[PDB]
Amino acid sequence: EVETFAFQAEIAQLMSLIINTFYSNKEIFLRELISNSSDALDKIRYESLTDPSKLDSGKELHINLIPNKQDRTLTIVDTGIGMTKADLINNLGTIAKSGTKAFMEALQAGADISMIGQFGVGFYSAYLVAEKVTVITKHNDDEQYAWESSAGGSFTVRTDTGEPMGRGTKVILHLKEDQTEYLEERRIKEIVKKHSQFIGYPITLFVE
Numbered sequence: 708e709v710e711t712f713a714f715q716a717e718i719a720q721l722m723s724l725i726i727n728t729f730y731s732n733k734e735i736f737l738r739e740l741i742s743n744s745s746d747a748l749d750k751i752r753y754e755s756l757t758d759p760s761k762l763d764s765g766k767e768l769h770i771n772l773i774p775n776k777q778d779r780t781l782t783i784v785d786t787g788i789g790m791t792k793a794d795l796i797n798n799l800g801t802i803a804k805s806g807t808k809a810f811m812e813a814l815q816a817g818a819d820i821s822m823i824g825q826f827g828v829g830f831y832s833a834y835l836v837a838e839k840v841t842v843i844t845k846h847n848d849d850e851q852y853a854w855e856s857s858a859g860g861s862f863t864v865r866t867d868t869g870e871p872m873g874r875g876t877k878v879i880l881h882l883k884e885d886q887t888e889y890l891e892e893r894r895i896k897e898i899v900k901k902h903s904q905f906i907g908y909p910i911t912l913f914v915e
């Protein structure tokens with residue numbers, strides 16, 4: 708069963724702004740994805756200190772960057788804490804609503820799109836380069852879910868039947884036709900070196 712949900716007006720407004728505003732410094736999407744992955748890894752690492760059984764779903768704490776030219780997709784995989792069904796549908800929406808208002812107020816005041824991360828809505832920068840974003844996630848206390856949106860005011864949530872992840876999050880970016888540069892090995896390496904060189908987890912860039 709595939710469940711369809713409407714984004715709250717502010718999120719839909721944020722998504723429309725990211726997709727249609729003229730902004731050339733699109734590369735910042737990768738640092739935002741890597742930062743969310745890093746925070747998710749920090750959370751599971753901290754929780755494992757008081758409860759070691761939280762690592763039974765996987766001991767390895769890492770980030771994988773997987774480009775695919777045939778499918779025109781860039782996948783960001785982490786072995787972080789993951790997200791529950793409540794996180795995907797309710798919990799993060801509330802946070803993102805206030806985050807959007809403050810960000811859109813800051814943009815009106817002269818701030819730029821690269822500052823999106825400071826408002827906790829950095830995830831939505833994925834729409835600078837992607838026409839569709841798929842989020843496969845597995846949290847210890849819940850099942851494996853697939854969140855998906857091509858914007859247009861709606862998102863879907865379904866129980867994932869694909870390859871079991873153990874624990875973590877997979878962000879599949881179905882890239883826009885003119886954004887294929889983010890599939891090039893030399894381009895990804897350059898972005899990682901410039902914006903994410905001090906991330907405290909191994910970042911493995913897969914080759915084709």
Ligand SMILES: Cc1c2c(n3c1CCN(Cc1ccco1)c1cc(C(N)=O)c(Cl)cc1-3)CC(C)(C)CC2=O
Pocket residue numbers: 743744747785787788789790794795796798799800802803827828830842854875876878
């Ligand atoms: C905000 C936001 C949002 C999403 N993420 C965030 C930022 C915080 N966070 C997790 C969190 C904090 C508290 C509870 O859960 C995320 C972690 C990851 C990750 N790599 O583990 C990823 Cl891909 C996206 C998100 C994803 C969404 C599809 C649910 C939409 C959204 O609105």
